Structures are given as structure tokens and as C-alpha cells.
Amino acid sequence: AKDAWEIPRESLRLEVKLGQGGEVWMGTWNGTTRVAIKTLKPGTMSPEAFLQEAQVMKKLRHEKLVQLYAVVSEEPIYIVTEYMNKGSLLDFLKGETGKYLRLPQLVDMSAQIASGMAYVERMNYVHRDLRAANILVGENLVCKVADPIKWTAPEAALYGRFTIKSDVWSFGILLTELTTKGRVPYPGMVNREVLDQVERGYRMPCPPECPESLHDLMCQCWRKEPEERPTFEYLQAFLEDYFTSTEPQYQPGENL
Numbered sequence: 001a002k003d004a005w006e007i008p009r010e011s012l013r014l015e016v017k018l019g020q021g022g023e024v025w026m027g028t029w030n031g032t033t034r035v036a037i038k039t040l041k042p043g044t045m046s047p048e049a050f051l052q053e054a055q056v057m058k059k060l061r062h063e064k065l066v067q068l069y070a071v072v073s074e075e076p077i078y079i080v081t082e083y084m085n086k087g088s089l090l091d092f093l094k095g096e097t098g099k100y101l102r103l104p105q106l107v108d109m110s111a112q113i114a115s116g117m118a119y120v121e122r123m124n125y126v127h128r129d130l131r132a133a134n135i136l137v138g139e140n141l142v143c144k145v146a147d148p149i150k151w152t153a154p155e156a157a158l159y160g161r162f163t164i165k166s167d168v169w170s171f172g173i174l175l176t177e178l179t180t181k182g183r184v185p186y187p188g189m190v191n192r193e194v195l196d197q198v199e200r201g202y203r204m205p206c207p208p209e210c211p212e213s214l215h216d217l218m219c220q221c222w223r224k225e226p227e228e229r230p231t232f233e234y235l236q237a238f239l240e241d242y243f244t245s246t247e248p249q250y251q252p253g254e255n256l
Ligand SMILES: COc1cccc(-c2cn(-c3ccc(CN4CCC(O)CC4)cc3)c3ncnc(N)c23)c1
Pocket: 018, 019, 020, 024, 036, 037, 038, 066, 079, 080, 081, 082, 083, 084, 085, 087, 088, 091, 136, 146, 147
């Protein structure tokens, strides 16, 4: 028995291909509604498993989470959502526009992600794979949460203990992506080195031109003890108010 998210497949025209991993397409829904469509390439994972993402997307509704529109829950299975016309944050950061972003833009992007994740937090959910590649960018630099040892808290990577606090860890790592225009965290380190070093207390240093106040925040996100890590509610307020309350004398530099 289907729910009120169900639509007939015939209402979808998959136009322009965007990515693969099944796939994701640009497309149209009913009359004149531009959407994104996730496909399941037969075999790779079970229907139930591909319909994890949709089922959670059904209960999560917020301005800074990518919005589910519809689902075709019989094969070939499709998930349908709003279309994010600037694609992934990671690609945006690394792209041609990426280099013009300065700290005011990057922090605002972080504030928006924190807000979506603050909502995930209030709803008692856990994301598990929070990072720039899973943030989508739209018009007016809107960032939405959608959808990785280097991004994963140690307790989670080692013991499968994923909580909102391990999401906070990942958010700290995401701040390094933002402040380096999308560089891979722990430059030159393989996953084993990162595990080994993090366990001995190593944390990434302050990125070049990143204000110390922003790095301290990263460090708080990376506290060994999950419960000592800030809430997203806290992160959202800090990042929202950053240039008044925290760094009121910020001046542009070469890159940030
Ligand atoms: C069911 O609908 C969903 C659910 C979850 C995510 C997406 C999604 C993914 N993308 C997407 C964005 C960027 C890329 C970029 N890509 C990977 C790295 C790079 O090499 C270039 C190609 C691929 C897919 C979207 N773009 C625009 N709009 C989207 N909704 C997406 C859609």
C-alpha cells in the first residue's frame, strides 16, 4: 500500500544527467516543475535500502534540507526532490566561483548547514555522512543538507556509535572544507594515519587566514568526548552572529 508521496512514473521525464555512484538526473514533474530524480541501477542495493533515504526525507521538512517531492516506490525506483541548480557544495567550492568566496560567504554557508542540522538535531535524527559533497547549493548561495573516515568521529568510525554529536564532529571537518575552498581534510594523510593520529590527540591546525575563533570552534567540534561537543543549535547561533559577536574587526585577506 502506497502513501500520499507516491506518483505515477509517467509523470516524470528524466532530461539531463547530473551524476552517478544508481544515478541522479535533472528533469520535469507533471506540467512545469523542475525536479531532481535519483535512480536505482538494478542490483546495487535493495528496494528497502534505497527507500531508507526517501522514508527519512518524508519525515524531515526544513528550508535547509533538500525537499522530497515524490517517490516511485516500485521498480525502477525513483526519488524526487527540488532541484539544486548549483550542485554539490564540494564542486562549488573547488569550482570557478569557489575561488571568489570569502569568509563572510563561507560562514553564512556554514550557518545554513548548521540550521538544517539543528533541525535534524531537534527531530532526534542522525545524518551519518555530513560533508561538503552531501551539501547542495542553489540560487543565492542557499545550502541544503542532502543524502568517509576523515569526516567521521573516532567513536563512530571505530565502534559504530553514530549520534548527533558525531555529526558535530563531521561539521567541524566540513568547516575545514569551507575554509580551504574544498581541500581534502588531513592533507597528505591516508585513512590509517588519520585514525592513528586523531586517536593520539592530533587535530588539523588553523587553515591559512582562518581566524583563530573559527578554528577554536572546529576544535570544540572535535572534542574526544562526544558530550563535550557543541550542539548544532549553538553552532547555528555562533555562525549566524559571527561577524558582530565574534569577529567584529574581520578584514578580507588574500583568500578569506
Ligand atoms: C532524489 O533526489 C536527490 C536526493 C539527494 C541528492 C540529490 C542531488 C544530487 N545532486 C548532485 C549534485 C552534484 C553532483 C556532482 N558530481 C560529483 C562530483 C564531480 O566529479 C562532478 C559530478 C552530482 C549529483 C543534485 N544536483 C541538483 N539537485 C539535486 N537534488 C541533487 C537528489
